[PDB]
Nucleic acid binder design. Structure first.
Length: 66
RNA sequence: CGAAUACGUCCCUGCUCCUUGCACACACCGCCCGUCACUCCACCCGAGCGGGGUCCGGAUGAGGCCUGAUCUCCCUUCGGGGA
């Protein structure tokens, strides 16, 4: 089972986030769908290294922060 | 014998430093305020009582000193004079 999720490759790590420091804000680039290159900034939970791939249930949320 | 998870954060709980304000420095378990109650102190407002000054009146007012009459006494230069 894998619903309409859209892959997204991680290109750059930015600061960490979360009240308890578990979250990591990150810059990612979609790979499939209609964007096919539109970078975007998401708040990801867990360990990440560049090159990782996170799949998103949407793409039009775009949390932003410093 | 033998892992899971994170490779971070200050949210909670604590510590360290810097900065700021403070009526605190046995240092916030700090300092401190007023009412009420208890003891004492002197100080007002004073009912009341009783004196003593002082200004106005009213009345009486001792006494002395001026004078008029009258009386008595003594001196008389017979003029009066004195008490």
């Amino acid at each position: 089972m894998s619903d309409e999720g859209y892959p997204a490759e991680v290109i750059e790590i930015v600061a960490r986030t979360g009240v308890t420091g578990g979250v990591t804000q990150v810059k990612v680039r979609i790979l499939e769908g209609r964007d096919k290159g539109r970078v975007i900034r998401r708040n990801v939970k867990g360990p990440v290294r560049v090159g990782d791939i996170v799949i998103l249930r949407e793409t039009e949320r775009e949390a932003r922060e410093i």
